[PDB]
Amino acid sequence: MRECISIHVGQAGVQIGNACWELYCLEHGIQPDGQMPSDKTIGGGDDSFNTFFSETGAGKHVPRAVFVDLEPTVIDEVRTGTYRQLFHPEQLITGKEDAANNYARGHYTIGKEIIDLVLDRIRKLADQCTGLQGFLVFHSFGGGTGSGFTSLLMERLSVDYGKKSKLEFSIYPAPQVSTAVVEPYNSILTTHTTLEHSDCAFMVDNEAIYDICRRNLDIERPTYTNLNRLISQIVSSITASLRFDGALNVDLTEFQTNLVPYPRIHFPLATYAPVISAEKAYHEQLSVAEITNACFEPANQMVKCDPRHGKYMACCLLYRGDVVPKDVNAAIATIKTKRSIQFVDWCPTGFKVGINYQPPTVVPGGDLAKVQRAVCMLSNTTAIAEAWARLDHKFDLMYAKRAFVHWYVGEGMEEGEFSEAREDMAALEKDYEEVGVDSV
Amino acid sequence: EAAEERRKYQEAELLKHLAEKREHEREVIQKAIEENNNFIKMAKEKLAQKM
Amino acid sequence: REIVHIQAGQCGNQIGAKFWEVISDEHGIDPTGSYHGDSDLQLERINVYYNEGNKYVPRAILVDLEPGTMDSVRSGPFGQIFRPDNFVFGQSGAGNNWAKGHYTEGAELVDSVLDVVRKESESCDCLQGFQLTHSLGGGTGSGMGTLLISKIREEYPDRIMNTFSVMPSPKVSDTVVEPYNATLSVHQLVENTDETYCIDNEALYDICFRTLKLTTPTYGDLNHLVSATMSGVTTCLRFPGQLNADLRKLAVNMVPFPRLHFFMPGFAPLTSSQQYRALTVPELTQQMFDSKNMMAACDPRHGRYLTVAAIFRGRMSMKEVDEQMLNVQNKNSSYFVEWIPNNVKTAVCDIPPRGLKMSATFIGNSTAIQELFKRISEQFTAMFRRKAFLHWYTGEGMDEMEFTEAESNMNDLVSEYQQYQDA
Numbered sequence: 001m002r003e004c005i006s007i008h009v010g011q012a013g014v015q016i017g018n019a020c021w022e023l024y025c026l027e028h029g030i031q032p033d034g035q036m037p038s039d040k041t042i043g044g045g046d047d048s049f050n051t052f053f054s055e056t057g058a059g060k061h062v063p064r065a066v067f068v069d070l071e072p073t074v075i076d077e078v079r080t081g082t083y084r085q086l087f088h089p090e091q092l093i094t095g096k097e098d099a100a101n102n103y104a105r106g107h108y109t110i111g112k113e114i115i116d117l118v119l120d121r122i123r124k125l126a127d128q129c130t131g132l133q134g135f136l137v138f139h140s141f142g143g144g145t146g147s148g149f150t151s152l153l154m155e156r157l158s159v160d161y162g163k164k165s166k167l168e169f170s171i172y173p174a175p176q177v178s179t180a181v182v183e184p185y186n187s188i189l190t191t192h193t194t195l196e197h198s199d200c201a202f203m204v205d206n207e208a209i210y211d212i213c214r215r216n217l218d219i220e221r222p223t224y225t226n227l228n229r230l231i232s233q234i235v236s237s238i239t240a241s242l243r244f245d246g247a248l249n250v251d252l253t254e255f256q257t258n259l260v261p262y263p264r265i266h267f268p269l270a271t272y273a274p275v276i277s278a279e280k281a282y283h284e285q286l287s288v289a290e291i292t293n294a295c296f297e298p299a300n301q302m303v304k305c306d307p308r309h310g311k312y313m314a315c316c317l318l319y320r321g322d323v324v325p326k327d328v329n330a331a332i333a334t335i336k337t338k339r340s341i342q343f344v345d346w347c348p349t350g351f352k353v354g355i356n357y358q359p360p361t362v363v364p365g366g367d368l369a370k371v372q373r374a375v376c377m378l379s380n381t382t383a384i385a386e387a388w389a390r391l392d393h394k395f396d397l398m399y400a401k402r403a404f405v406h407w408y409v410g411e412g413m414e415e416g417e418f419s420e421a422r423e424d425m426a427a428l429e430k431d432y433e434e435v436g437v438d439s440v
Numbered sequence: 441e442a443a444e445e446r447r448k449y450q451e452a453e454l455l456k457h458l459a460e461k462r463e464h465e466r467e468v469i470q471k472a473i474e475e476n477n478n479f480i481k482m483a484k485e486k487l488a489q490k491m
Numbered sequence: 492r493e494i495v496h497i498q499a500g501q502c503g504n505q506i507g508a509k510f511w512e513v514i515s516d517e518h519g520i521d522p523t524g525s526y527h528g529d530s531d532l533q534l535e536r537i538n539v540y541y542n543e544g545n546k547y548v549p550r551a552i553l554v555d556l557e558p559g560t561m562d563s564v565r566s567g568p569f570g571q572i573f574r575p576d577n578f579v580f581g582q583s584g585a586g587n588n589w590a591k592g593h594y595t596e597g598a599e600l601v602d603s604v605l606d607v608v609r610k611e612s613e614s615c616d617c618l619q620g621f622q623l624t625h626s627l628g629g630g631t632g633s634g635m636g637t638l639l640i641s642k643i644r645e646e647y648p649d650r651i652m653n654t655f656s657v658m659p660s661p662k663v664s665d666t667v668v669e670p671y672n673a674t675l676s677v678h679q680l681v682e683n684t685d686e687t688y689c690i691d692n693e694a695l696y697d698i699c700f701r702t703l704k705l706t707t708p709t710y711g712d713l714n715h716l717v718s719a720t721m722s723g724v725t726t727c728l729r730f731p732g733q734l735n736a737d738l739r740k741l742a743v744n745m746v747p748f749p750r751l752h753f754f755m756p757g758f759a760p761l762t763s764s765q766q767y768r769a770l771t772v773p774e775l776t777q778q779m780f781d782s783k784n785m786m787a788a789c790d791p792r793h794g795r796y797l798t799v800a801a802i803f804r805g806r807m808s809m810k811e812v813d814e815q816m817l818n819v820q821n822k823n824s825s826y827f828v829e830w831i832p833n834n835v836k837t838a839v840c841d842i843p844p845r846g847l848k849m850s851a852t853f854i855g856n857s858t859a860i861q862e863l864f865k866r867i868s869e870q871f872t873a874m875f876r877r878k879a880f881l882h883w884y885t886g887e888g889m890d891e892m893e894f895t896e897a898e899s900n901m902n903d904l905v906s907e908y909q910q911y912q913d914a
């Protein structure tokens with residue numbers, strides 16, 4: 001009951017999926033062969049972690065997940081990697097030819113060859129659920145598969161599962177971490193196409209994560225492994241309420257009520273703390289007040305933007321570990337007298353708090369320090385439109401010359417789809433302006 | 441008997457009001473069904489047309 | 492004269508289960524349903540709330556659209572005592588959404604509940620009516636609960652409907668949509684209940700923080716107040732004495748105009764216990780009527796009492812109670828209406844609650860309750876003028892028109908209460 005199925009699309013989605021499922025296993029005490037010695041109900045159960053793991057009669061705990069990519073070499077590393085035994089071979093789906101950084105090939109030319117198979121595997125997972133809650137979809141904006149195949153998959157999921165909820169973790173492109181020149185095109189195309197099909201989308205700016213790794217973990221040039229371990233901690237914070245329970249636990253769906261005031265305004269800003277090296281964590285205990293304070297520092301955002309220059313329509317604090325509400329309330333009282341926290345005039349100004357007691361874990365031999373308490377803030381701020389403005393500007397620069405547009409037309413697309421997608425982004429930006437304006 | 445009949449008239453008005461509530465309840469849920477189905481049909485047709 | 496108790500949603504079942512723990516103790520019923528008490532006032536009217544191997548079973552129906560909280564009741568101290576077939580629950584939940592409780596998720600489950608209601612009502616020698624516990628801020632208690640009330644009225648139109656309705660407050664809030672759910676629910680209650688005890692989470696929080704000096708109040712703290720109130724407010728229904736009250740006499744005597752049936756309870760002494768100094772009758776009467784002791788965040792001095800019913804519990808001077816009760820009216824005659832003579836009545840019961848040698852409980856029909864509906868109306872309007880968060884409801888089939896009509900009906904209610912504050 002309340003199962004969530006995760007779908008990992010393209011290289012970014014798959015590699016982040018590797019990191020996330022490894023972290024889940026460590027948090028839950030599941031070994032790489034899928035055995036979970038603490039779990040006394042063999043082959044089934046209704047425990048909180050069963051929202052994310054099914055069980056075989058042989059004691060294996062299997063991610064409710066599908067990994068899909070149009071080339072094989074990233075999923076092959078899952079097939080041969082440390083956690084190969086976690087997954088049934090049928091959950092890992094690959095084609096032979098990727099989308100060549102081209103939305104059109106991911107959505108149409110190549111993607112249409114494998115979409116029916118992907119949907120048949122997802123159906124196989126859904127059929128094992130007694131009360132499917134929805135989907136979590138992991139993908140980049142910029143790749144041909146992450147943009148184009150994900151939009152196709154989302155459109156098909158709406159047809160096959162109705163209004164069943166679909167949440168995204170979307171990797172927003174940054175020049176620092178490698179990136180095709182056409183990624184602004186792919187980003188706008190997939191954002192426009194998926195907008196009506198997604199209920200809530202957590203954007204993750206690769207530049208934000210890159211900066212956090214360089215600045216807080218003192219890593220000179222972070223790798224994908226560095227970025228994805230940090231990303232998995234944010235994902236884990238956000239899904240922890242689904243996977244654990246406790247008296248102070250608040251379900252992600254309750255936060256979602258507060259975070260989405262209009263269907264299209266569904267892009268929360270995530271901030272996480274604390275991110276600290278082993279050397280600095282040793283002999284330093286970060287208190288509740290300390291980590292809370294860190295959420296309001298822009299350097300700790302998942303997306304680069306300035307909330308001081310927008311307005312809030314919601315603020316949610318997801319705590320894990322050694323945290324009691326008394327310390328939370330005090331920390332928030334302090335924050336509210338020292339920070340620029342301006343809400344829109346049509347929404348209440350309370351912070352919604354949840355506490356998950358299970359403490360955070362880290363991957364042994366990684367760079368993140370193990371801490372006793374952490375927090376992820378989810379806010380809905382009009383400032384997140386700065387991220388769309390930045391992407392729309394790069395789009396416009398190229399599109400006014402039609403640079404690279406022939407690679408999409410060659411695959412059957414029309415310029416009409418470009419201007420329609422760009423107009424939808426313009427209306428999105430205007431939506432964010434309108435909701436921040438004071439009421440008459 | 442005239443007072444009894446007045447009680448009966450008032451109960452009948454009441455049950456008639458509650459009957460109007462039940463039909464509104466029916467209209468709301470069939471409206472939700474109709475809109476979910478029209479979403480699915482719209483999405484299916486746009487996808488087919490664009491492919 | 493049997494009462495059928497229904498508890499719906501998370502809040503409903505939590506304050507519901509506390510109510511049964513408290514009164515089961517007062518009547519000497521242990522968690523396993525066997526009576527092991529020491530007095531016979533305990534069993535004389537036991538059948539008002541319990542059915543009868545000489546074990547007693549609460550005439551209680553437990554309803555929720557998700558199984559969580561009712562798993563918690565079944566594991567709690569008195570969980571063994573409820574009739575297992577009277578647990579009626581779904582799996583989907585209501586997502587803090589009135590529309591889901593009232594129109595989609597709840598509609599699926601409501602007929603099962605009415606089958607259990609019907610069975611309980613058939614084993615009734617003479618059914619007084621119904622008592623429902625729920626909040627107005629969520630989805631199941633609010634949306635499905637008012638749907639139940641409507642279906643119950645249609646099947647038992649000549650029986651009394653009584654609710655303990657927990658009103659939401661930004662000071663103790665789960666979601667931003669609470670004003671929407673509460674406004675939609677108040678409309679249902681104005682039409683389909685005969686008596687509603689307004690239990691205001693803002694007042695309970697204030698009382699826990701200021702008076703009880705609990706700086707981090709939990710729902711457990713709030714529910715300690717609600718439990719004490721529910722016990723005191725039902726005393727004359729459950730115990731024999733001078734005045735044997737029932738739900739219909741309650742309504743005839745406290746409700747001068749059919750829509751103004753929303754009561755402010757009050758209680759004394761307020762406790763989080765920890766104190767052994769029993770209060771003098773003067774002190775009970777003083778605190779009970781103090782604003783700082785009322786479970787709805789309304790200033791009675793901002794309005795007028797239409798009717799008041801007070802009950803004193805424990806052993807104490809009947810003569811001193813009458814003297815202090817008469818003192819409070821004769822000293823603040825301005826806060827009682829002139830056009831309802833002798834509108835304050837007082838009862839006594841020898842059997843005190845638990846941990847208290849004497850207590851006082853107050854039922855008031857005060858025009859100051861309009862402040863609570865104004866507060867909600869303001870919060871409702873702040874979002875609704877921008878149609879904020881409405882898609883959660885239109886996605887379930889609802890139209891904006893229904894919100895407009897609910898806003899209108901609640902403002903009418905506020906107006907009607909003000910009409911009689913100036914009479």
Ligand SMILES: COc1cc([C@@H]2c3cc4c(cc3[C@H](Sc3nnc[nH]3)[C@@H]3COC(=O)[C@H]23)OCO4)cc(OC)c1OC
Pocket residue numbers: 101178179180181
């Ligand atoms: C085979 O030779 C190369 C090709 C590219 C080239 C390539 C060439 C480019 C370019 C981008 C990109 C993209 S980069 C990308 N990273 N993630 C997604 N896409 C892609 C990637 O793979 C590629 O092959 C593309 O911008 C201007 O010139 C790049 C090269 O080095 C930088 C290689 O130099 C020999």
Ligand SMILES: COc1cc([C@@H]2c3cc4c(cc3[C@H](Sc3nnc[nH]3)[C@@H]3COC(=O)[C@H]23)OCO4)cc(OC)c1OC
Pocket residue numbers: 724725726727728734735736737738739740741744745798799800801802833834835836837838854
């Ligand atoms: C539900 O508990 C109570 C109810 C009443 C209540 C009740 C409530 C009233 C009221 C009168 C009356 C009358 S009193 C009466 N005595 N003989 C005939 N009628 C009646 C009797 O039965 C009732 O139920 C009525 O005036 C204003 O508010 C009163 C209470 O205490 C005074 C009780 O506890 C506070």
Ligand SMILES: Nc1nc2c(ncn2[C@@H]2O[C@H](COP(=O)(O)OP(=O)(O)OP(=O)(O)O)[C@@H](O)[C@H]2O)c(=O)[nH]1
Pocket residue numbers: 009010011012013015016069070098099100101102106140141142143144145146147171172173174177178179180183206224227228231
């Ligand atoms: N954070 C993070 N970003 C990644 C990772 N892998 C790729 N990216 C980013 O994703 C974008 C490129 O998309 P990919 O996922 O690699 O491409 P794809 O989905 O496989 O699409 P095609 O190869 O064109 O078929 C660029 O912005 C990359 O920086 C990763 O492991 N972690």
Ligand SMILES: Nc1nc2c(ncn2[C@@H]2O[C@H](COP(=O)(O)OP(=O)(O)O)[C@@H](O)[C@H]2O)c(=O)[nH]1
Pocket residue numbers: 499500501502503505506585586587588626627628629630631632633657658659660663664665669692695710713714717
């Ligand atoms: N006093 C009190 N209020 C509660 C309790 N639980 C929830 N609430 C309030 O009830 C409203 C939320 O409704 P809830 O009962 O949880 O939702 P439901 O299960 O869909 O009916 C909010 O206003 C909460 O503050 C409780 O145990 N005691």
Ligand SMILES: [Ca+2]
Pocket residue numbers: 279280281282283284
């Ligand atoms: Ca140090």
Ligand SMILES: [Mg+2]
Pocket residue numbers: 010011071098099143145
């Ligand atoms: Mg690729």
Ligand SMILES: [Mg+2]
Pocket residue numbers: 501502629665
């Ligand atoms: Mg709740």
Ligand code: NA
Pocket residue numbers: 039040041042043044045046047055
């Ligand atoms: Na199990």
Ligand code: NA
Pocket residue numbers: 583596599
């Ligand atoms: Na259903």
